[PDB]
Symmetry: C2
Subunit: 125 residues, 2 copies
């Protein structure tokens, strides 16, 4: 099957943020775990918006991952509104111009982010 | 072996889930034993505790201040160093704050652990 990923970020006035999104895009695309990998933004009218990434992708299922720490306003309101998806917390399985689309949970709670905190001190790799 | 502390510095939210995420990271690292002390603080919209207050509560040689942020944005390059009286800009920053050694570390954004966290929002292992 063809499985898609869209990474949805906040963006920033400073360039580093977009550059970080492109870094994960490239790392994940070159791994081959998904057939298609794109980035999108969910704040400040930043482009691409999630709908623009999704419309370009020809996949049987597309996962949208919020690159955000918590269930806040951007994740529970801005992102769902942008997709026409339900507001609030939790994973959301939906259809979007006849494609299957699942918004995932924010990364914040993951043990890998605990480890990223540790590794900001330990600098392993 | 030196007395090492960690201050995790976050953005916060008008909703509750950010504070609980911060608390969960603090609690995980406290129980792991990796550091002598772990505290949380905030670097947006006058949120509390601020980094200066977390540090003043700490009994350590060195304190590593870790930005819980994706990038070197306005919060990382302006708010966080202003709240510490450190100069603005990119990069790691090491100095002293009222007599204790403080290292502002890099934000977590570029870590391979963030790439894997992205993968695990999909794969949901653990």
């Amino acid at each position: 099957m063809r499985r898609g990923l869209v990474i949805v970020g906040h963006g920033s006035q400073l360039n580093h943020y977009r550059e970080v999104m492109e870094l994960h895009r490239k790392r994940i695309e070159e791994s081959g775990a998904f057939d298609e990998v794109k980035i999108a933004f969910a704040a400040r009218k930043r482009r691409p918006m999630p709908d623009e990434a999704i419309r370009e992708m020809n996949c049987d299922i597309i996962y949208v991952v919020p690159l955000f720490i918590s269930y806040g306003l951007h994740v529970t309101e801005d992102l769902p509104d942008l997709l026409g998806f339900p507001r609030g917390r939790g994973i959301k399985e939906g259809e979007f111009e006849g494609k299957k689309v699942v918004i995932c949970e924010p990364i914040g709670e993951d043990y890998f982010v605990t480890y990223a905190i540790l590794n900001s001190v330990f600098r392993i790799g």
